[PDB]
Amino acid sequence: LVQHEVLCSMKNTYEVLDFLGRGTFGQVVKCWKRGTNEIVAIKILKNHPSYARQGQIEVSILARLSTENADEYNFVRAYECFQHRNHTCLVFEMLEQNLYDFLKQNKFSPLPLKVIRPILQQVATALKKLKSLGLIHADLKPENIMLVDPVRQPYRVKVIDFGSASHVSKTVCSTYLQSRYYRAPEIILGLPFCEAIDMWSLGCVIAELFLGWPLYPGALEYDQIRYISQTQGLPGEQLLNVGTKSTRFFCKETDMSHSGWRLKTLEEHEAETGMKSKEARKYIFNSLDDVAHVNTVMDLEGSDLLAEKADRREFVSLLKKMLLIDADLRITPAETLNHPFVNMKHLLDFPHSNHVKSCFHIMDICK
């Protein structure tokens, strides 16, 4: 169960100092490595047989990632893995603050695109290495992207929480998987999924950093697929046909001139499940292009505004490619690093803008 005040390792030695967090399963606690000046995070896993298979596969993925010991691809370095009492725990490096707590303390104010760009490049590099190994993170949320040091190393991030990671398999998710606000349509509709469910999650977080609030903050999976379809259009017919959960949110309407699929109205869903659906979006978009026209009051003069408008033009261009409902056509982590928003090739067309001089400056410092 829960423990405190002291801990014991087989090869090293750790003394627990303060609790760090508690999830659905698996507790993380901050401790001090005795004999050194290092602070590390230890994630304990309860020794229940029904959770033993998920606990073992997480250790298998960390050992395969630890071969990439350089971790220049921005991963949390896993040190060792021992067993205390009858439980199995993992030792990670101690990062400072995750992106959600960074937005919370700033009253969820939007972040400029010049700060979003370094974070996007680092996470896309991580997902480029995850596809290189045939792995899925399956839990990419702002709570799982932590800043190494917000003051010493400004805007350097790493990804955490592999408790949902798994190898690529041709198996439909039986129920739910990723976090709801960042869940790909494949998991909602009951479709075969691969590594593209993290490209969808990365689109919902860079949009959350730009707006301050989640892009699709649906309380239920119906609200989630409703916001997506109302903003980006209904999913394709071939996708809704082979979708297992596709019948729980859509219906086969057949008028004289109607097509095949349509959404269940708020009146229909409220009668089917009894739950009245309320609006939770801070931003309602008829199109992803309306994201570029959000929060448009800046101090940028004519020289800098011509570039910020070009910056937003490429941000919604990448965001649309990252939020394509069809996972077969969704942009890949390798292509995202080659998108003009990350290449900054569209900012080169400006002779000397004092804003683009800072945009390029924030990028080459993240090293």
mmCIF file of C-alpha atoms in Angstrom:
data_model
loop_
_atom_site.group_PDB
_atom_site.id
_atom_site.type_symbol
_atom_site.label_atom_id
_atom_site.label_comp_id
_atom_site.label_asym_id
_atom_site.label_seq_id
_atom_site.Cartn_x
_atom_site.Cartn_y
_atom_site.Cartn_z
ATOM 1 C CA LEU A 1 0.000 0.000 0.000
ATOM 2 C CA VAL A 2 1.129 3.646 0.506
ATOM 3 C CA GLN A 3 4.425 4.140 2.429
ATOM 4 C CA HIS A 4 6.510 7.123 3.595
ATOM 5 C CA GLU A 5 9.469 8.457 5.609
ATOM 6 C CA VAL A 6 11.871 5.714 4.457
ATOM 7 C CA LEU A 7 12.479 3.471 1.447
ATOM 8 C CA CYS A 8 14.898 0.726 0.420
ATOM 9 C CA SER A 9 16.477 -0.177 -2.921
ATOM 10 C CA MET A 10 18.274 -3.392 -3.825
ATOM 11 C CA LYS A 11 21.295 -1.747 -5.493
ATOM 12 C CA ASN A 12 20.949 1.919 -4.492
ATOM 13 C CA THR A 13 19.196 3.537 -1.520
ATOM 14 C CA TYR A 14 16.397 6.113 -1.422
ATOM 15 C CA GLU A 15 14.612 8.048 1.327
ATOM 16 C CA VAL A 16 11.120 9.249 0.438
ATOM 17 C CA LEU A 17 10.626 12.963 1.122
ATOM 18 C CA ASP A 18 7.233 14.040 -0.250
ATOM 19 C CA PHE A 19 4.408 12.630 -2.347
ATOM 20 C CA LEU A 20 4.288 13.624 -6.013
ATOM 21 C CA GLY A 21 1.029 12.327 -7.484
ATOM 22 C CA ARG A 22 -1.589 9.593 -7.571
ATOM 23 C CA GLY A 23 -3.254 8.325 -10.739
ATOM 24 C CA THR A 24 -5.750 5.606 -11.564
ATOM 25 C CA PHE A 25 -3.085 2.998 -10.782
ATOM 26 C CA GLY A 26 0.536 3.566 -9.833
ATOM 27 C CA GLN A 27 1.780 6.097 -7.281
ATOM 28 C CA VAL A 28 4.734 8.439 -7.824
ATOM 29 C CA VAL A 29 6.656 9.883 -4.871
ATOM 30 C CA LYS A 30 9.642 12.228 -4.650
ATOM 31 C CA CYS A 31 12.647 10.793 -2.802
ATOM 32 C CA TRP A 32 16.337 11.510 -2.221
ATOM 33 C CA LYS A 33 19.099 9.182 -3.408
ATOM 34 C CA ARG A 34 21.163 8.645 -0.259
ATOM 35 C CA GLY A 35 24.858 9.447 -0.553
ATOM 36 C CA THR A 36 24.410 11.960 -3.395
ATOM 37 C CA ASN A 37 22.740 15.318 -4.068
ATOM 38 C CA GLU A 38 20.239 13.852 -6.545
ATOM 39 C CA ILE A 39 16.451 13.964 -6.233
ATOM 40 C CA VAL A 40 14.587 11.270 -8.170
ATOM 41 C CA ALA A 41 10.977 10.231 -8.724
ATOM 42 C CA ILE A 42 9.971 6.638 -7.948
ATOM 43 C CA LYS A 43 6.749 5.232 -9.429
ATOM 44 C CA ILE A 44 5.451 2.277 -7.410
ATOM 45 C CA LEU A 45 3.100 -0.333 -8.877
ATOM 46 C CA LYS A 46 0.701 -2.299 -6.684
ATOM 47 C CA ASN A 47 1.241 -6.071 -6.688
ATOM 48 C CA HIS A 48 -2.176 -7.146 -7.841
ATOM 49 C CA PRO A 49 -2.384 -10.008 -10.368
ATOM 50 C CA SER A 50 -4.982 -8.198 -12.496
ATOM 51 C CA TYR A 51 -2.559 -5.276 -12.977
ATOM 52 C CA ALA A 52 0.619 -7.367 -13.248
ATOM 53 C CA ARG A 53 0.510 -7.617 -17.048
ATOM 54 C CA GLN A 54 0.258 -3.844 -17.506
ATOM 55 C CA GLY A 55 3.013 -3.304 -14.945
ATOM 56 C CA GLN A 56 5.354 -5.700 -16.745
ATOM 57 C CA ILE A 57 4.796 -4.302 -20.246
ATOM 58 C CA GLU A 58 5.598 -0.797 -18.986
ATOM 59 C CA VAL A 59 8.976 -2.014 -17.712
ATOM 60 C CA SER A 60 9.560 -3.757 -21.051
ATOM 61 C CA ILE A 61 9.066 -0.486 -22.941
ATOM 62 C CA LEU A 62 11.317 1.500 -20.593
ATOM 63 C CA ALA A 63 14.151 -0.999 -21.068
ATOM 64 C CA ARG A 64 13.770 -0.732 -24.848
ATOM 65 C CA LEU A 65 13.844 3.067 -24.536
ATOM 66 C CA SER A 66 16.825 2.989 -22.161
ATOM 67 C CA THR A 67 18.947 1.646 -25.028
ATOM 68 C CA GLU A 68 18.474 5.165 -26.432
ATOM 69 C CA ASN A 69 20.406 6.365 -23.395
ATOM 70 C CA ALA A 70 21.294 9.714 -24.988
ATOM 71 C CA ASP A 71 17.598 10.712 -24.882
ATOM 72 C CA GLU A 72 18.298 13.661 -27.165
ATOM 73 C CA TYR A 73 14.742 12.905 -28.367
ATOM 74 C CA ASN A 74 13.409 14.393 -25.090
ATOM 75 C CA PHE A 75 12.370 11.489 -22.883
ATOM 76 C CA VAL A 76 12.455 11.184 -19.110
ATOM 77 C CA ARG A 77 15.583 9.178 -18.324
ATOM 78 C CA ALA A 78 14.689 5.973 -16.472
ATOM 79 C CA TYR A 79 17.556 5.092 -14.131
ATOM 80 C CA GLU A 80 16.854 1.678 -12.586
ATOM 81 C CA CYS A 81 14.007 -0.649 -11.627
ATOM 82 C CA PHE A 82 13.958 -2.590 -8.351
ATOM 83 C CA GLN A 83 11.371 -4.268 -6.116
ATOM 84 C CA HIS A 84 10.502 -3.006 -2.629
ATOM 85 C CA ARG A 85 8.367 -5.128 -0.274
ATOM 86 C CA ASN A 86 6.215 -7.149 -2.734
ATOM 87 C CA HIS A 87 5.802 -4.268 -5.214
ATOM 88 C CA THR A 88 7.787 -3.283 -8.305
ATOM 89 C CA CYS A 89 8.803 0.360 -8.738
ATOM 90 C CA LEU A 90 10.675 2.476 -11.284
ATOM 91 C CA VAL A 91 13.240 5.250 -10.786
ATOM 92 C CA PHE A 92 12.952 8.318 -13.027
ATOM 93 C CA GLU A 93 14.703 11.670 -13.125
ATOM 94 C CA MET A 94 12.985 14.526 -11.300
ATOM 95 C CA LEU A 95 11.607 17.182 -13.638
ATOM 96 C CA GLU A 96 10.253 20.528 -12.449
ATOM 97 C CA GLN A 97 6.801 21.446 -13.769
ATOM 98 C CA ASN A 98 4.363 20.020 -16.304
ATOM 99 C CA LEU A 99 2.578 22.110 -18.916
ATOM 100 C CA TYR A 100 -0.819 22.051 -17.182
ATOM 101 C CA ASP A 101 0.585 23.514 -13.960
ATOM 102 C CA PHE A 102 2.423 26.092 -16.083
ATOM 103 C CA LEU A 103 -0.884 27.196 -17.615
ATOM 104 C CA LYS A 104 -2.735 27.061 -14.280
ATOM 105 C CA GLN A 105 -0.419 29.520 -12.521
ATOM 106 C CA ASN A 106 -0.669 31.898 -15.509
ATOM 107 C CA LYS A 107 -4.503 31.917 -15.326
ATOM 108 C CA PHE A 108 -4.613 29.814 -18.526
ATOM 109 C CA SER A 109 -3.502 32.775 -20.614
ATOM 110 C CA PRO A 110 -2.670 31.982 -24.255
ATOM 111 C CA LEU A 111 0.972 31.466 -25.149
ATOM 112 C CA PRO A 112 2.614 33.104 -28.183
ATOM 113 C CA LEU A 113 3.452 30.951 -31.183
ATOM 114 C CA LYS A 114 7.168 31.658 -30.677
ATOM 115 C CA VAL A 115 7.015 29.713 -27.382
ATOM 116 C CA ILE A 116 4.755 26.982 -28.755
ATOM 117 C CA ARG A 117 7.234 26.256 -31.559
ATOM 118 C CA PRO A 118 10.124 24.895 -29.408
ATOM 119 C CA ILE A 119 7.755 22.681 -27.403
ATOM 120 C CA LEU A 120 6.244 21.303 -30.612
ATOM 121 C CA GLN A 121 9.662 20.532 -32.109
ATOM 122 C CA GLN A 122 10.802 18.628 -29.013
ATOM 123 C CA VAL A 123 7.644 16.521 -28.670
ATOM 124 C CA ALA A 124 7.536 15.778 -32.404
ATOM 125 C CA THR A 125 11.134 14.560 -32.136
ATOM 126 C CA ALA A 126 10.034 12.242 -29.320
ATOM 127 C CA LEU A 127 7.158 10.870 -31.405
ATOM 128 C CA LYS A 128 9.522 10.538 -34.374
ATOM 129 C CA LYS A 129 11.651 8.183 -32.267
ATOM 130 C CA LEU A 130 8.574 6.354 -30.951
ATOM 131 C CA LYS A 131 7.464 5.503 -34.490
ATOM 132 C CA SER A 132 11.062 4.480 -35.234
ATOM 133 C CA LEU A 133 10.598 1.837 -32.511
ATOM 134 C CA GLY A 134 6.992 0.963 -33.385
ATOM 135 C CA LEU A 135 5.573 2.227 -30.086
ATOM 136 C CA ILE A 136 2.536 4.262 -29.035
ATOM 137 C CA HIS A 137 2.424 6.584 -26.033
ATOM 138 C CA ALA A 138 -1.412 6.539 -25.791
ATOM 139 C CA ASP A 139 -1.489 9.211 -23.056
ATOM 140 C CA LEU A 140 -0.107 12.451 -24.513
ATOM 141 C CA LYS A 141 -1.602 15.273 -22.444
ATOM 142 C CA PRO A 142 -0.229 18.518 -20.955
ATOM 143 C CA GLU A 143 0.047 16.716 -17.608
ATOM 144 C CA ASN A 144 2.546 14.365 -19.306
ATOM 145 C CA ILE A 145 4.829 17.048 -20.791
ATOM 146 C CA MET A 146 7.117 18.472 -18.105
ATOM 147 C CA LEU A 147 9.595 21.348 -18.190
ATOM 148 C CA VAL A 148 13.127 20.354 -17.189
ATOM 149 C CA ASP A 149 13.893 23.723 -15.576
ATOM 150 C CA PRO A 150 11.671 26.749 -16.329
ATOM 151 C CA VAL A 151 14.333 29.290 -15.275
ATOM 152 C CA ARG A 152 17.676 27.592 -15.971
ATOM 153 C CA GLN A 153 16.732 25.895 -19.277
ATOM 154 C CA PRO A 154 13.795 27.947 -20.597
ATOM 155 C CA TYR A 155 11.257 25.974 -22.645
ATOM 156 C CA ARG A 156 12.898 22.536 -22.655
ATOM 157 C CA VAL A 157 10.420 19.689 -22.217
ATOM 158 C CA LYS A 158 10.245 15.912 -21.858
ATOM 159 C CA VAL A 159 7.421 13.361 -21.925
ATOM 160 C CA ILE A 160 6.369 11.201 -18.972
ATOM 161 C CA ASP A 161 3.847 8.516 -18.006
ATOM 162 C CA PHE A 162 4.366 5.377 -20.098
ATOM 163 C CA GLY A 163 1.738 3.540 -18.022
ATOM 164 C CA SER A 164 -0.451 3.501 -21.140
ATOM 165 C CA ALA A 165 2.279 2.898 -23.734
ATOM 166 C CA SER A 166 2.114 -0.198 -25.927
ATOM 167 C CA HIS A 167 3.527 -1.660 -29.116
ATOM 168 C CA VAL A 168 1.678 -1.251 -32.405
ATOM 169 C CA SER A 169 -0.950 -3.968 -32.826
ATOM 170 C CA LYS A 170 -3.911 -4.526 -35.148
ATOM 171 C CA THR A 171 -6.420 -4.530 -32.291
ATOM 172 C CA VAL A 172 -9.367 -2.194 -31.771
ATOM 173 C CA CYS A 173 -9.456 -0.585 -28.301
ATOM 174 C CA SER A 174 -12.214 -2.527 -26.442
ATOM 175 C CA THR A 175 -13.431 0.614 -24.567
ATOM 176 C CA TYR A 176 -11.473 3.875 -23.951
ATOM 177 C CA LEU A 177 -7.693 4.589 -23.958
ATOM 178 C CA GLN A 178 -6.147 8.089 -24.128
ATOM 179 C CA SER A 179 -7.332 11.068 -22.110
ATOM 180 C CA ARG A 180 -10.702 12.246 -23.367
ATOM 181 C CA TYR A 181 -9.848 15.778 -24.518
ATOM 182 C CA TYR A 182 -6.911 14.463 -26.590
ATOM 183 C CA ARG A 183 -8.380 11.139 -27.742
ATOM 184 C CA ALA A 184 -8.166 10.390 -31.453
ATOM 185 C CA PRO A 185 -11.408 9.630 -33.337
ATOM 186 C CA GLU A 186 -10.189 6.054 -33.867
ATOM 187 C CA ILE A 187 -10.468 5.294 -30.146
ATOM 188 C CA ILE A 188 -13.862 7.018 -29.930
ATOM 189 C CA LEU A 189 -15.370 5.221 -32.936
ATOM 190 C CA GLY A 190 -13.810 1.812 -32.239
ATOM 191 C CA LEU A 191 -11.376 1.624 -35.152
ATOM 192 C CA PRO A 192 -7.933 0.057 -35.640
ATOM 193 C CA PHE A 193 -5.314 2.519 -34.426
ATOM 194 C CA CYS A 194 -1.550 2.936 -34.644
ATOM 195 C CA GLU A 195 0.872 5.703 -33.643
ATOM 196 C CA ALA A 196 -1.407 8.389 -35.126
ATOM 197 C CA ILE A 197 -3.410 8.731 -31.896
ATOM 198 C CA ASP A 198 -0.470 10.701 -30.472
ATOM 199 C CA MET A 199 -0.378 13.022 -33.487
ATOM 200 C CA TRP A 200 -4.008 13.817 -32.662
ATOM 201 C CA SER A 201 -3.122 14.424 -29.007
ATOM 202 C CA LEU A 202 -0.247 16.686 -30.050
ATOM 203 C CA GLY A 203 -2.669 18.722 -32.150
ATOM 204 C CA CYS A 204 -5.073 19.192 -29.243
ATOM 205 C CA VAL A 205 -2.299 20.427 -26.925
ATOM 206 C CA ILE A 206 -0.624 22.923 -29.271
ATOM 207 C CA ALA A 207 -4.141 24.256 -29.830
ATOM 208 C CA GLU A 208 -4.648 24.281 -26.055
ATOM 209 C CA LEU A 209 -1.408 26.218 -25.559
ATOM 210 C CA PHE A 210 -2.505 28.726 -28.217
ATOM 211 C CA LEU A 211 -6.033 29.186 -26.821
ATOM 212 C CA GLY A 212 -5.266 28.649 -23.124
ATOM 213 C CA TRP A 213 -8.198 26.222 -22.805
ATOM 214 C CA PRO A 214 -8.677 22.724 -24.272
ATOM 215 C CA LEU A 215 -9.805 22.615 -27.888
ATOM 216 C CA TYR A 216 -12.391 19.834 -27.382
ATOM 217 C CA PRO A 217 -13.288 19.699 -23.657
ATOM 218 C CA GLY A 218 -16.160 17.237 -23.982
ATOM 219 C CA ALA A 219 -17.509 15.634 -20.821
ATOM 220 C CA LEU A 220 -18.544 12.460 -22.682
ATOM 221 C CA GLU A 221 -17.354 10.705 -25.821
ATOM 222 C CA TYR A 222 -20.542 11.926 -27.509
ATOM 223 C CA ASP A 223 -19.659 15.543 -26.716
ATOM 224 C CA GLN A 224 -16.101 14.842 -27.873
ATOM 225 C CA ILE A 225 -17.064 13.507 -31.306
ATOM 226 C CA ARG A 226 -19.740 16.218 -31.503
ATOM 227 C CA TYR A 227 -17.244 19.071 -31.118
ATOM 228 C CA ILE A 228 -14.854 17.444 -33.603
ATOM 229 C CA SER A 229 -17.516 16.855 -36.250
ATOM 230 C CA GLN A 230 -19.078 20.301 -35.776
ATOM 231 C CA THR A 231 -15.646 21.942 -36.212
ATOM 232 C CA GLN A 232 -13.925 19.684 -38.768
ATOM 233 C CA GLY A 233 -16.851 17.919 -40.456
ATOM 234 C CA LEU A 234 -18.407 14.509 -39.916
ATOM 235 C CA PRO A 235 -16.069 11.505 -40.229
ATOM 236 C CA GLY A 236 -16.017 9.617 -43.498
ATOM 237 C CA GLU A 237 -18.648 7.016 -44.279
ATOM 238 C CA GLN A 238 -16.088 4.215 -44.618
ATOM 239 C CA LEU A 239 -14.759 5.125 -41.164
ATOM 240 C CA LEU A 240 -18.211 5.145 -39.548
ATOM 241 C CA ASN A 241 -19.123 1.850 -41.244
ATOM 242 C CA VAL A 242 -16.364 -0.274 -39.678
ATOM 243 C CA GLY A 243 -16.599 1.636 -36.404
ATOM 244 C CA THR A 244 -17.806 -0.518 -33.524
ATOM 245 C CA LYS A 245 -18.713 2.401 -31.245
ATOM 246 C CA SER A 246 -19.785 4.395 -34.325
ATOM 247 C CA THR A 247 -23.439 3.466 -33.749
ATOM 248 C CA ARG A 248 -23.435 4.949 -30.229
ATOM 249 C CA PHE A 249 -23.025 8.533 -31.501
ATOM 250 C CA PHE A 250 -24.349 8.493 -35.095
ATOM 251 C CA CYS A 251 -27.410 7.035 -36.810
ATOM 252 C CA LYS A 252 -28.383 5.729 -40.250
ATOM 253 C CA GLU A 253 -30.735 8.437 -41.484
ATOM 254 C CA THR A 254 -32.249 7.711 -44.912
ATOM 255 C CA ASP A 255 -34.322 10.515 -46.417
ATOM 256 C CA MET A 256 -35.189 10.711 -50.117
ATOM 257 C CA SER A 257 -31.958 12.640 -50.796
ATOM 258 C CA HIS A 258 -30.017 12.039 -47.568
ATOM 259 C CA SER A 259 -26.696 10.208 -47.453
ATOM 260 C CA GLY A 260 -25.905 7.499 -44.916
ATOM 261 C CA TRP A 261 -24.701 8.867 -41.584
ATOM 262 C CA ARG A 262 -25.606 11.833 -39.399
ATOM 263 C CA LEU A 263 -25.024 12.888 -35.812
ATOM 264 C CA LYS A 264 -27.529 12.208 -33.059
ATOM 265 C CA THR A 265 -29.047 15.532 -32.035
ATOM 266 C CA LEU A 266 -28.836 16.779 -28.456
ATOM 267 C CA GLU A 267 -32.507 15.843 -28.047
ATOM 268 C CA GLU A 268 -31.913 12.304 -29.324
ATOM 269 C CA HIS A 269 -28.829 11.620 -27.194
ATOM 270 C CA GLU A 270 -30.487 13.076 -24.089
ATOM 271 C CA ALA A 271 -33.356 10.613 -24.547
ATOM 272 C CA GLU A 272 -31.092 7.617 -25.216
ATOM 273 C CA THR A 273 -28.813 7.949 -22.172
ATOM 274 C CA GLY A 274 -30.754 10.397 -19.982
ATOM 275 C CA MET A 275 -27.799 12.793 -19.654
ATOM 276 C CA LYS A 276 -28.390 16.380 -20.752
ATOM 277 C CA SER A 277 -25.421 17.681 -22.750
ATOM 278 C CA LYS A 278 -24.079 21.152 -21.936
ATOM 279 C CA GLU A 279 -21.469 23.246 -23.716
ATOM 280 C CA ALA A 280 -17.962 23.296 -22.248
ATOM 281 C CA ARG A 281 -15.865 24.913 -24.999
ATOM 282 C CA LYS A 282 -14.298 28.296 -24.335
ATOM 283 C CA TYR A 283 -13.888 28.616 -28.124
ATOM 284 C CA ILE A 284 -16.506 27.445 -30.635
ATOM 285 C CA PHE A 285 -15.119 27.079 -34.161
ATOM 286 C CA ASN A 286 -17.027 26.489 -37.377
ATOM 287 C CA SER A 287 -13.603 25.727 -38.899
ATOM 288 C CA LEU A 288 -10.015 25.274 -37.756
ATOM 289 C CA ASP A 289 -9.175 28.412 -39.756
ATOM 290 C CA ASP A 290 -11.072 30.458 -37.150
ATOM 291 C CA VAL A 291 -8.245 29.587 -34.741
ATOM 292 C CA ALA A 292 -6.041 32.012 -36.681
ATOM 293 C CA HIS A 293 -8.572 34.807 -36.040
ATOM 294 C CA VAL A 294 -8.583 34.269 -32.246
ATOM 295 C CA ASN A 295 -6.773 36.641 -29.856
ATOM 296 C CA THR A 296 -5.687 39.140 -32.493
ATOM 297 C CA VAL A 297 -4.922 42.194 -30.313
ATOM 298 C CA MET A 298 -1.131 42.460 -30.050
ATOM 299 C CA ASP A 299 1.462 45.221 -29.780
ATOM 300 C CA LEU A 300 3.124 44.187 -33.050
ATOM 301 C CA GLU A 301 3.608 47.006 -35.552
ATOM 302 C CA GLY A 302 3.137 46.619 -39.306
ATOM 303 C CA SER A 303 6.522 44.966 -39.811
ATOM 304 C CA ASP A 304 5.946 42.336 -37.116
ATOM 305 C CA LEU A 305 2.209 41.869 -37.728
ATOM 306 C CA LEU A 306 2.814 40.788 -41.331
ATOM 307 C CA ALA A 307 4.847 37.882 -39.917
ATOM 308 C CA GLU A 308 2.501 36.989 -37.052
ATOM 309 C CA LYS A 309 -0.292 36.725 -39.622
ATOM 310 C CA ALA A 310 1.998 34.461 -41.651
ATOM 311 C CA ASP A 311 2.828 32.547 -38.462
ATOM 312 C CA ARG A 312 -0.854 31.868 -37.753
ATOM 313 C CA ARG A 313 -1.432 30.967 -41.414
ATOM 314 C CA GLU A 314 1.040 28.091 -41.041
ATOM 315 C CA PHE A 315 -0.113 27.184 -37.522
ATOM 316 C CA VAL A 316 -3.662 26.371 -38.636
ATOM 317 C CA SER A 317 -2.155 24.722 -41.723
ATOM 318 C CA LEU A 318 -0.226 22.300 -39.515
ATOM 319 C CA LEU A 319 -3.049 22.012 -36.972
ATOM 320 C CA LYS A 320 -5.433 20.910 -39.725
ATOM 321 C CA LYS A 321 -2.954 18.284 -40.929
ATOM 322 C CA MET A 322 -2.498 17.086 -37.335
ATOM 323 C CA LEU A 323 -6.267 16.939 -36.682
ATOM 324 C CA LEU A 324 -7.303 15.013 -39.793
ATOM 325 C CA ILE A 325 -9.984 12.504 -38.804
ATOM 326 C CA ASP A 326 -8.580 9.987 -41.299
ATOM 327 C CA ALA A 327 -5.524 8.534 -39.555
ATOM 328 C CA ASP A 328 -4.213 7.235 -42.894
ATOM 329 C CA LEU A 329 -3.877 10.825 -44.154
ATOM 330 C CA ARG A 330 -2.820 12.391 -40.843
ATOM 331 C CA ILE A 331 0.589 14.052 -40.784
ATOM 332 C CA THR A 332 3.481 11.943 -39.395
ATOM 333 C CA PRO A 333 6.042 13.123 -36.802
ATOM 334 C CA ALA A 334 8.690 13.195 -39.545
ATOM 335 C CA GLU A 335 6.579 15.499 -41.726
ATOM 336 C CA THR A 336 5.678 17.761 -38.787
ATOM 337 C CA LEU A 337 9.360 18.581 -38.272
ATOM 338 C CA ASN A 338 9.408 19.537 -41.974
ATOM 339 C CA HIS A 339 6.291 21.717 -41.810
ATOM 340 C CA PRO A 340 6.891 25.424 -42.559
ATOM 341 C CA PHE A 341 5.782 26.273 -39.006
ATOM 342 C CA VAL A 342 8.805 24.395 -37.641
ATOM 343 C CA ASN A 343 11.151 25.200 -40.545
ATOM 344 C CA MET A 344 10.420 28.942 -40.158
ATOM 345 C CA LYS A 345 11.034 29.236 -43.907
ATOM 346 C CA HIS A 346 8.041 31.590 -44.113
ATOM 347 C CA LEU A 347 9.746 34.009 -41.698
ATOM 348 C CA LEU A 348 12.838 34.275 -43.924
ATOM 349 C CA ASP A 349 10.864 36.419 -46.399
ATOM 350 C CA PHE A 350 11.026 39.311 -43.903
ATOM 351 C CA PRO A 351 14.215 41.429 -44.106
ATOM 352 C CA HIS A 352 14.459 42.537 -40.469
ATOM 353 C CA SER A 353 11.434 42.174 -38.198
ATOM 354 C CA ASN A 354 12.269 42.588 -34.517
ATOM 355 C CA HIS A 355 9.639 39.937 -33.728
ATOM 356 C CA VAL A 356 11.002 37.273 -36.085
ATOM 357 C CA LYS A 357 14.475 37.954 -34.687
ATOM 358 C CA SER A 358 13.073 36.768 -31.354
ATOM 359 C CA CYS A 359 11.196 33.872 -32.977
ATOM 360 C CA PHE A 360 14.443 32.465 -34.372
ATOM 361 C CA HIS A 361 16.165 33.299 -31.074
ATOM 362 C CA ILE A 362 13.809 31.228 -28.903
ATOM 363 C CA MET A 363 14.426 28.214 -31.162
ATOM 364 C CA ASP A 364 18.237 28.020 -31.113
ATOM 365 C CA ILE A 365 18.290 28.404 -27.299
ATOM 366 C CA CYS A 366 16.238 25.268 -26.609
ATOM 367 C CA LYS A 367 19.439 23.250 -27.180
#
